[PDB]
């Protein structure tokens, strides 16, 4: 069975992708995250730090990782009617931690992306606004700066 060191290794391997994007590897990370919500705090701090630290052209893929895990966890909260935003080891708390950094992560990823990746980030902002993943007021602040 996939363990946390495997999760680390998989994320580390994104460096080796020209595009920084892999649907199958994102799916592996997301399945692991859904199976190990009991350690979401270190999963979440890692994917936040991956977005902070990855190369410029890989910023888009870092937001796809956050999108995949974030909306999988968001779906759990609605299946489970849970809003324990401050309880570690819960989907609601994981999404809350991501939301506290998401404006920083978006601003940096957009600023460091070329025009093509910027347009793909714009599409993510649409999906995050429609799905309810992050506070719309946070996404508004980003969208008004970069996409209006």
């Amino acid at each position: 069975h996939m363990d946390f060191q495997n999760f680390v290794a998989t994320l580390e391997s994104f460096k080796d992708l020209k595009s920084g994007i892999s649907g199958s590897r994102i799916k592996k990370l997301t399945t692991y995250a859904l199976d190990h919500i009991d350690i979401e705090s270190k999963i979440i701090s890692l994917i936040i730090d991956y977005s902070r630290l990855c190369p410029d052209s890989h910023k888009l893929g870092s937001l796809y990782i956050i999108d995949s895990i974030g909306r999988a966890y968001l779906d759990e909260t609605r299946s489970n009617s849970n809003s324990s935003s401050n309880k570690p080891g819960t989907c609601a708390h994981a999404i809350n931690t991501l939301g506290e950094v998401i404006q920083e992560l978006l601003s940096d990823a957009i600023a460091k992306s070329n025009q093509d990746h910027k347009e793909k980030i714009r599409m993510l902002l649409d999906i995050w606004d429609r799905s309810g993943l992050f506070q719309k007021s946070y996404l508004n602040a980003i969208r008004s700066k970069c996409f209006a």
Binding site: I21, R25, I26, Y64, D67, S68
Partner: peptide
């Protein structure tokens, strides 16, 4: 091996 958010 693209990713398209759904």
């Amino acid at each position: 091996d693209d990713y398209t958010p759904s």
